[PDB]
């Protein structure tokens, strides 16, 4: 079931990139798998550079952890930063040098939808604290697809919007009081946005929460370890109920507990 985050486990390393192209990146599974994929299917994008187009796909967890990809997709336009997600058969990613979110259907390699996130800063305006052009961060939780960003009107505070996964329309929007560039990353669990304090520390914390159901903001002190000292991506998977992260070449996962 659902609840408030109360604990994060130790990071477990599932795969380590062998080249500088994977110093930062995004890896993910689909919380709503659709044919021909399953809950084991894994995608990995090494995101260093300026023409990021290769998406590595692995049918099996064993292949993700020990082998070569089973398929490589070449995106039709370059991707920006580490914020992408996979949801219900599509990769949702941000176009390079844009505030455009793109829905790319993985089995057909068809762009099904594109949407400018209204007012969103991009390309170094409202990144997380490490930089990396992390202005726009997609998220999946128990209720579906969201996007995390900021705007000039919000003065750089985290804004989050629920997204229609079919056509990318914004369905509802909330404004927090958390400066986006003051936190290392963020993710959503059960409709509550959580932030991480530091991308370098072994003794970081999950330090803020904003509950979209109640409008209430809280401070937290839940320990969070950046084992390799440079976490570029931290997302939540609601099917596995785990955090997925990318830390200085390493694809890692953290158990959690909800109350
Ligand atoms: Ca995130
Ligand atoms: Na994301």
Residue numbers in the entry: 244 to 502
Task: Pull verbatim passages from the article behind this deposition.
Inherited missense mutations in the myocilin (MYOC) gene, within its olfactomedin (OLF) domain, constitute the strongest genetic link to primary open-angle glaucoma via a toxic gain of function, and thus MYOC is an attractive precision-medicine target. Myocilin has no known function, and there is no glaucoma phenotype in Myoc knockout mice or in individuals with a homozygous N-terminal truncation mutation or hemizygous deletion of MYOC, but rare non-synonymous coding mutations lead to toxic intracellular sequestration of misfolded myocilin. However, not all mutations in MYOC cause glaucoma, and common variants are expected to be neutral polymorphisms. Among the common features associated with pathogenic myocilin misfolding, we demonstrate that a single metric, OLF thermal stability, can robustly segregate benign from early-onset disease variants.
At the outset of our study, five variants could be confidently predicted as benign polymorphisms: T293K, T353I, K398R, A445V and K500R. These mutations are all found on the protein surface and well documented in the literature. Thr to Lys and Thr to Ile are less conservative changes, but in prior studies, T293K and T353I exhibited wild type (WT)-like cellular secretion and WT-like thermal stability, and were found in the control group for case–control clinical studies. Assessment of spent media from cells expressing each of the 16 full-length myocilin variants revealed WT-like secretion for T256M, R296H, L303I, S313F, V329M, S331L, T353I, A445V, V449I and K500R. The detergent-insoluble myocilin fractions were highest for E300K, S313F, T353I and N420Y. Indeed, in our cellular assay, some misfolding characteristics were initially detected for T353I and S313F but, ultimately, other characteristics including thermal stabilities were found to be within the bounds of benign variants. Structural integrity was further confirmed by high-resolution crystal structures, which were solved for 11 OLF variants. No gross changes from WT OLF were detected for the structures of T293K, R296H, L303I, V329M, S331L, E352K, T353I, K398R, A445V, V449I or K500R, indicating that these mutations are accommodated within the native five-bladed β-propeller fold and do not perturb the dinuclear calcium-containing site.
